[PDB]
C-alpha cells in the first residue's frame, strides 16, 4: 500500500494548527488504509511520554507512529553490544567520592575534593531525572544529564556558558552521537554517528541521511514537508522514486512587510518546485498569489483535515468572548484589546476568555492592566481541551494580520459557533460568509468588528442560527473524504 512520512522539527504538547493538521491528516488517512507516520528531529528524551498525553488528550491516532533519528540510531546502536557499559557513571561516582556532598536543598548538592582544593561537581536530583554540572576554577564546563537511572545526553560549555558540544548515549550505556554547536551562530555544526563511524557537517546531512535509511527508494512511499524550515533536508534525499510533497501552512510574504517580500524558508520551497513532485497550499488565493512570480507549474490546492466533532445542545447562556491560539504577534492581541475596551464600554458583563500560550502573554496583561480589563479580557492558559471551552462561548474572534487555514475559527463554526475575523490574506476570507455563519470585518477595523460582537451578545437566537450555518459550512466544503481523493489523486 501507500505509506506516507510526514516531516517536522518537533511535537510537544503545548503547539498549534500544523501539528493538529498533520495528526487529524495522519488519522482520516489511516481511516482510508493510508500509513501516515510523523518524522522528528529533535531529542526529547520523554517522548514517549509526551505522545502518549497526545493519543490520551485525542490530539493522535494510536496507530500514528513518529519518527526520530536520535531514536532510530540509539535502536542501532543497542544492537551493537550486550551490556551496560557503567564506564561514565563509575566516573563521575568515582569523583564525587573523594569529595564532601554540600547540600544547599533536598534536589541542590554540591561536592569539594580537597585535592582539586574547589567545588567541581553540582548536582540537582528531582522525581525523574538527575543533573550533574561540573565545574573547574569555577566555570561550568559539562552538565551530565540522568533520566530513568541512565546517562541519556551531556552537554559541553565554554568560558562564557555557552553550549559548544552535545553527546547522546544509548541504552547499553554507549555514545552514538556527537554534534559541534556554533554558539555564535546559535546552529548545529559536525554531527557525528559513532554508531556507523561516519560524520555529517550539518543536521540536515545527518537528518537527510536517517530519511535515506528509515524509509526506502519506492514509489508507493511519500514525503509531505509540512515543516517549512525541514525542507531543506528532505530536499537534499538521494531518493529517486520516494514522492516528495510540500505544504505552505501560512502567509508566504514577510509578516509586516508589505513590500510584497517573501519568506527565505517559504521562498526555498516555491523556487526548488520543479526537484521536487507538487506543493500544496490550502487557499486558492495563496495558489495564485504563489504562480505569480513563480510560475509553478505543480500547485495544488487540497485543504487541511478538520475533525467533524458531533452536535450537541448549544444553548448559548453565557455572554463570553474566546480567541484560543498561541499568545504570538501572528495574531492581532492588541488589537484584540483595544475592540474589548469598546465592548465593555457598552456591555461590561461580556467577558473576553483568550486560551493558549505564548511569548507575548506579559505584553497582553500589561495592556489588559492598563485598562479596565481586569475583569472583562483574561487570559486562561493552553487548553488540551479547547472542545468543551468553546463549547461554553458565545463568539469566536480573529485580529490575525496574517494566517493559512484557521484550524480554530473552523472547528469553533463546526461546534455550532458564530465566528466575527478580520478580513485577512489566504485565510478566513474562503469559509467566513457575512450574515451566514458570522461577520468579515475589515483589517484595523476594531468599530465594525465590535458592534457584530455586541448584536451577538445580546442576540443568543441569531447566535445559535449562525453557528447552526457554520457547522454546515465546514461539512459541505471541507468533507474529509473530498481532500482525501484529492491527496490519492497526487500519490498516484
Ligand atoms: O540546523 P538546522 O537543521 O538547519 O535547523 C534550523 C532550525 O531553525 C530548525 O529548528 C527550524 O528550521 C525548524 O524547522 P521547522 O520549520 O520544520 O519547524 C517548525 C516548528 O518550529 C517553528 O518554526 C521554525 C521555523 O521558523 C522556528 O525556527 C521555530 O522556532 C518555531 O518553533 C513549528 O512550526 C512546529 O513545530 C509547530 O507548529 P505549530 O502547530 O505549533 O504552529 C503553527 C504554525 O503554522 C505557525 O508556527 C506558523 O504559522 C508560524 O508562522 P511563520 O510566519 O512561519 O513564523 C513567524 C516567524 O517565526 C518567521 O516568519 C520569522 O522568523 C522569519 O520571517
Ligand atoms: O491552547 C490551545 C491553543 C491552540 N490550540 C489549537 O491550535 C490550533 C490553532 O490553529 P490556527 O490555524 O488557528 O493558528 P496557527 O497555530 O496555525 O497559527 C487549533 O487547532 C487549536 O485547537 C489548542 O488546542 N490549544
Ligand atoms: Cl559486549
Known amino acids: 500500500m501507500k505509506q506516507t512520512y510526514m516531516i517536522v522539527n518537533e511535537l510537544d504538547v503545548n503547539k498549534g494548527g500544523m501539528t493538529t493538521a498533520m495528526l487529524t491528516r495522519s488519522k482520516f488517512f489511516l481511516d482510508n488504509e493510508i500509513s501516515g507516520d510523523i518524522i522528528t528531529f529533535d531529542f526529547k528524551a520523554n517522548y514517549k511520554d509526551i505522545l502518549k498525553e497526545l493519543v490520551q488528550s485525542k490530539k493522535m491516532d494510536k496507530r500514528t507512529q513518529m519518527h ?5 540510531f540509539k535502536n542501532i546502536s543497542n544492537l551493537q553490544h550486550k551490556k551496560y557499559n557503567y564506564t561514565m557513571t ?48 569555577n566555570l561550568r564546563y559539562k552538565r551530565i544529564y540522568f533520566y530513568k537511572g541512565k546517562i541519556v545526553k551531556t552537554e559541553v560549555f565554554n568560558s562564557d556558558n555557552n553550549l559548544i558540544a552535545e553527546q547522546f548515549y544509548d541504552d547499553n550505556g554507549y555514545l552514538y ?28 546531512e545527518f537528518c537527510s541521511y536517517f530519511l535515506d535509511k528509515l524509509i526506502p527508494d519506492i ?9 517549512p524550515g525541514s525542507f531543506p533536508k528532505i530536499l537534499k534525499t538521494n531518493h529517486k522514486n520516494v514522492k516528495k510533497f510540500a505544504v505552505i501552512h501560512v502567509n508566504h510574504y514577510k509578516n509586516f512587510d508589505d513590500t510584497g517580500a517573501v519568506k527565505k524558508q517559504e521562498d526555498y ?5 520543479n526537484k521536487i513532485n507538487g506543493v500544496v497550499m490550502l487557499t486558492e488565493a495563496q495558489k495564485k498569489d504563489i504562480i505569480e512570480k513563480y510560475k509553478i507549474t505543480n500547485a495544488y490546492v487540497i485543504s487541511n483535515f478538520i475533525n467533524i466533532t458531533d452536535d450537541y445542545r448549544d444553548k448559548n447562556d453565557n455572554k463570553v468572548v474566546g480567541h484560543i491560539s498561541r499568545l504570538v504577534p501572528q495574531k492581532g492581541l492588541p488589537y484584540l484589546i483595544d475592540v474589548a475596551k469598546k465592548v465593555v464600554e457598552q456591555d461590561n458583563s461580556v467577558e473576553f476568555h483568550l486560551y493558549g500560550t505564548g511569548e507575548e502573554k506579559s505584553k497582553i496583561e500589561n495592556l489588559i492592566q492598563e485598562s479596565n480589563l481586569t475583569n472583562n479580557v483574561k487570559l486562561l492558559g493552553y487548553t488540551t481541551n479547547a472542545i468543551e471551552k468553546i463549547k461554553d462561548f458565545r463568539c469566536v474572534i480573529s485580529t490575525s494580520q496574517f494566517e493559512g487555514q484557521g484550524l480554530s475559527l473552523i472547528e469553533a463554526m463546526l461546534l455550532k459557533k458564530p465566528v466575527v475575523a478580520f478580513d485577512v490574506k489566504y485565510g478566513p476570507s474562503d ?62
Open 269 to 273: 520551497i516555491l523556487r526548488n518546485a
Open 219 to 227: 514509489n508507493d512511499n511519500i514525503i509531505i514537508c509540512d515543516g
Open 68 to 72: 526520530n533519528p536520535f531514536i532510530y
Open 177 to 204: 552521537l556527537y554534534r559541534q554547536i556554533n554558539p555564535e551562530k546559535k546552529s548545529i555544526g559536525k554531527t557525528y554517528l559513532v554508531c556507523k563511524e561516519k560524520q555529517f557537517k550539518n543536521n540536515v
Open 431 to 492: 469559509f467566513v460568509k457575512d450574515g451566514k455563519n458570522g461577520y468579515l470585518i475589515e483589517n484595523k477595523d476594531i468599530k465594525k468588528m465590535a458592534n457584530k460582537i455586541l448584536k451577538l451578545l445580546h442576540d443568543k437566537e441569531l447566535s445559535k442560527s449562525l453557528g447552526k450555518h457554520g457547522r454546515d459550512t465546514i461539512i459541505d466544503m471541507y468533507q474529509p473524504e473530498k481532500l482525501m481523493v484529492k491527496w490519492k489523486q497526487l500519490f498516484n
Open 90 to 137: 563509575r566516573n563521575l561516582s568515582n569523583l564525587l567520592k573523594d569529595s564532601v556532598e554540600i547540600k544547599e536543598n533536598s534536589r541542590i548538592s554540591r561536592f569539594f575534593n580537597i585535592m582539586s582544593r574547589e567545588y567541581l561537581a553540582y548536582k540537582r536530583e528531582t522525581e525523574q531525572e538527575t543533573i550533574f554540572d561540573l565545574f573547574k576554577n
